[PDB]
């Protein structure tokens, strides 16, 4: 339920997470 964005190499995702 908790969406978290994350950047990676100037690439940011966005994973969620319950």
Known sequence: ???RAVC???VC???CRR
Do not use: K, L, N, Q
């Open 8 to 10: 990676r190499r100037g």
């Open 1 to 3: 339920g908790v969406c």
């Open 13 to 15: 995702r966005a994973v």
